RNA sequence: AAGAACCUUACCUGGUCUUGACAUCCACGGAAGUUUUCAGAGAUGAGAAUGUGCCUUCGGGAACCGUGAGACAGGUGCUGC
RNA sequence: CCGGCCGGGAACUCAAAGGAGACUGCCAGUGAUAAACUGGAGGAAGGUGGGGAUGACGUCAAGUCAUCAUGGCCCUUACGACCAGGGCUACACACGUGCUACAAUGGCGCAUACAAAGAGAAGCGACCUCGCGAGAGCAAGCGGACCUCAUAAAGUGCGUCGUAGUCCGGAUUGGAGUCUGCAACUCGACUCCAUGAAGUCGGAAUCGCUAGUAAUCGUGGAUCAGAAUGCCACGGUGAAUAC
């Protein structure tokens, strides 16, 4: 399995996506949610999504 | 104007939210008994200013006490002036 | 069921004149009310001595009556013996309880004097 | 005292919002205090340069401004590098990536802006109000405009009693909402006084 | 056509099945005797739903939705009215003239600056 | 009425009020904070509120326990 | 099943950028389920014109908040590859579930 | 006043002022900061421990901190006639 | 699972975009052959449909130099500035606003209903357990038509109170949970158990309101660590009278 083990704080950057080129810092990570909540900038625009690692692709 | 106002509030914030908000939080948590006590006396060793009870939530580009509205950010007198200039967006009067 | 007051029940609630003897609150007379559970506004005749005997108990196991007297006369008095203001402060007779006596308070006051 | 503001009420219906973005509770005002920064700094920046409107976009990961100039020329300076000094300091007053847009406003009389800023220039260069006022009306009564009002206030040619003088041309229909009015007002910071300078002016119903 | 709740008066919406049959109210699932039955008011609110003079055979099981108890009795009438020139339009005169079809737009004038009500304000002191 | 998670002392007091009960000879105690419930301990003690330039001095006894330091102190002077 | 959740505070804005959406699954070549509205967040602020003393006279200013939801059935790579600054409207916040 | 327990918050006691709580320079030294002891009602001091990282065409530049004289501040002080 | 819960459907309530409709448009009468007025048909709405925003030239030298900016004047080893504490909360009396009422068209006790608007990330907090209770601990769902705040309150069906100072609620120091721990003494509220005053519908006078209004019944907001009967919104039943 590629990547199988699951870092909190790493940082991928999908080509793919509307994510690439963009560059931001995770200040707060909502282990309560149980999602993962990053200020994701998409489309040009930095709005807080849920994630979860089966959600997206690791790159 | 009101110049000392200004940098007390500086003052309680970066007190607050800066060096605290962990260590009196851990200490109010220590202070409530889950199963002369430690964590009221350091508690009290703690700077008052820390205390986010002291913060008075005021404005930006004046200082007003009063009327300020913590999602505009600023006084009434000043959200009136950049509602009627355009600033904010979205706030138009209402008249249902 | 008279104990150490003035007031009897009479074809009435016990509650009333309970709550009437100075020394106590209501929760002794719901407490009662629960303790019984039959309807009160029957006549007192054949007054029960278990009926007696549960409101003296109950009466001993808390605050026993005449204690409000007691405890304003050495709330006065003993401020007044060592000097301070608070028992002083009740002795005057206006609201120190967090209340606004500017122009309310009539109830302490009485009727205004002009 | 008593008049509402015609960009604020026709702000839905007519005139457009001047700064346009969206952003939630916990990031609004920290955002309009930076767009107030920026264009406070801008405005006394390039008082000198006549600008008329700044809107400010912010897509929520960048900014971009649009500054709405009579004379483009000195707002870009010479290569862009005034307006690129201009973007970088747009930059770490906002805190993110900047962009600068140069919108050009043709008739720079028939801007209310620009109108009560050099009539604000004149009252501080000692030139007289009512010729400020004539030349301001006849200029846009020339230039096509169906109205213009404009209200000076205030300390008007060094007197101890200050008055408002009202000057008025054309149609200026304030009531009615489906008609544009480009209202702006001025400060003019003379020495015996603050002279206030209001004018109003009525391009169509739309 | 199947007979059915229509029309709004104050905040409510009707969601009557009324269909041919004995009338007897039941309300989700549950009887006007259980629910209101010697409610008094519940009369005159019954009324109302009698008054399109086309209950006599129809049987009534009314959920209408939202809102005070009058505004859902004028809902189910406005209901059946609707629903009766859905069936025919010869009785949409008759309807008329008794005053039925119109809906009641009367609703809550709002709170206003300066005053304790919609119209209601503070006690004046001439002095 | 107040709290009962812990009855709460002025940290300043309960050392002061600490050492002139291991020392047994002090003079009043000059405090300007208030609002501390007094322990078994201040008992023997005279411990001075604050109110105005002037003094008052309050010698605690067995009964004043369970109330504050200033309820014995008047902040304001009437008729 | 991906669920695009696009806020502004103009209903033309809103419009526009939702019927780009829909534009864009209609020319990858997906079942398309409509643009619903969800309810508008009509947040009123009443805040005093007079600097020292009215109660009576007070304006009330709203910032309305509009929501629509697309939930397009089908997601396709080619739609992922084109959702690059797609909606380029500064007044439209956007949220993206899986 | 769309929030008087402190704060807010100006009126009564202690502490401080040529840089003041608050910006600009000119001069010198130190990273910024973190963790503590003691006195005291406390911004007040008097002490301790770790961090000289960020860099300059190093003839050393930083957001910064401490101090010194000047300019300078500052004022919810008066006049809305 | 007899909960739309689950397939389905989009038929309706709805949610929210765009249209239509209401203009004296038609008819009759009055009126000058005009404006208009008065009725009638159609119609959900009828003649500004209701409400709101909108406040003309000016007036009071009305208010704010305490929001800010600003001219002149003054303090500047203080009229700047920090901390502790205190006052803004006191009280012989008088009016201005609102609340609780003087009960029986009402309480009190069991059961059973029907809304709308809003807020929420240091924020909203279910379910379970422990408590008479305020609440505590465990704690899902949530940056929102989901989840939470939040099984509204009058309306009730049966009973009981049938002068009762009534659950109408006043009154110091307690017995308490909770807020921030500078800290509930001067100083928060909450079932507070604290003795159940007064007022048995109110003199001269006075105030608010022509239809969902008055009156009554409950709910949410903003300020905000907490602290409303004030302010800012929302719903229910529903008047009487204009000669």
Redesign the interface.
Known sequence: RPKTLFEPGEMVRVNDGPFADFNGVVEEVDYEKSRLKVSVSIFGRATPVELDFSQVEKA | AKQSMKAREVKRVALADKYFAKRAELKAII???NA??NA??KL??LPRDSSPSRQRNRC??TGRPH?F??????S??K??E??????????????? | ARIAGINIPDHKHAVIALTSIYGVGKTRSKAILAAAGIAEDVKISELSEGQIDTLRDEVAKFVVEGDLRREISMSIKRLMDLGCYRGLRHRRGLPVRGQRTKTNARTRKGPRKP | GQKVHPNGIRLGIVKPWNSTWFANTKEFADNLDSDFKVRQYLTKELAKASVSRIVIERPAKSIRVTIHTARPGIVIGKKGEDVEKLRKVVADIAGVPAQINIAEVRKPELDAKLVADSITSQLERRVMFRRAMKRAVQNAMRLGAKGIKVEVSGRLGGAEIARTEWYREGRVPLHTLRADIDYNTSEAHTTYGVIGVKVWIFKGEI | NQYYGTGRRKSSAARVFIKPGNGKIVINQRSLEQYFGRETARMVVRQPLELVDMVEKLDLYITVKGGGISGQAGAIRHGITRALMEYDESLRSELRKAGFVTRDARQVERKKVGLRKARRRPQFSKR | RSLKKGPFIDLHLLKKVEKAVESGDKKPLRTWSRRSTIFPNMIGLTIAVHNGRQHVPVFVTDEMVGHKLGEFAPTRTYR | RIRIRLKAFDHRLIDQATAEIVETAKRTGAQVRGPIPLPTRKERFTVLISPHVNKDARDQYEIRTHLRLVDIVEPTEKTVDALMRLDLAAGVDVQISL
């Open positions: 202070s409530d008994v002369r006590w009221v006396l009290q060793t930006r580009q009327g509205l913590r999602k505009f950010g600023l009434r007198i959200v009136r950049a509602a009627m200039r355009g600033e904010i967006p979205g706030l138009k009067k209402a008249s249902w």
